[PDB]
Amino acid sequence: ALDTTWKEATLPQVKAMLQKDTGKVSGDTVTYSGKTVHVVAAAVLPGFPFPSFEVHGKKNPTLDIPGGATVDVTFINTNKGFGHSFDITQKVPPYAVMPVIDPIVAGTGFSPVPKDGKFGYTNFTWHPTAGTYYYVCQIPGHAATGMFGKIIVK
Ligand SMILES: [Cu+]
Numbered sequence: 304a305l306d307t308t309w310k311e312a313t314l315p316q317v318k319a320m321l322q323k324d325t326g327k328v329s330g331d332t333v334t335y336s337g338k339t340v341h342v343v344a345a346a347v348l349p350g351f352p353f354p355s356f357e358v359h360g361k362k363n364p365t366l367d368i369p370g371g372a373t374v375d376v377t378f379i380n381t382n383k384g385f386g387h388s389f390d391i392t393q394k395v396p397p398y399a400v401m402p403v404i405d406p407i408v409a410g411t412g413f414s415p416v417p418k419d420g421k422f423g424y425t426n427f428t429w430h431p432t433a434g435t436y437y438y439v440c441q442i443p444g445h446a447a448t449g450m451f452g453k454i455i456v457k
Pocket of ligand 1: 354441
């Protein structure tokens with residue numbers, strides 16, 4: 304039951320999607336507001352550290368989400384040669400090389416690798432209850448080496 308349905312986007316389409324994250328940045332936190340919020344996350348945008356996620360142009364930021372909101376996540380894999388995933392868990396860091404993160408509350412399978420001048424992306428919806436979550440990549444070693452961030456749902 305992970306989201307394993309992918310579409311393909313050209314680079315100008317990727318840039319257009321990254322700009323549609325509806326959060327507001329303060330330091331290394333992104334704060335969302337409203338009834339429906341749009342999170343747009345990318346795996347290793349050009350020039351950012353490997354391995355990492357970027358959301359609203361920040362590396363692995365803490366996401367602050369209002370209670371009761373509908374969360375629409377768009378995940379784009381921009382990293383040549385790797386098929387990163389985006390998975391939400393309540394299991395905490397530090398993560399092992401093969402992390403134990405079940406149950407996965409929402410998230411993706413492994414993404415397509417970039418090819419033919421295009422990039423794979425997907426959309427999924429999430430209706431969380433209040434608490435702390437983490438977003439992680441499942442490729443062995445990546446979470447252990449820093450590819451994760453925190454989500455606080457009020
Ligand atoms: Cu990864």
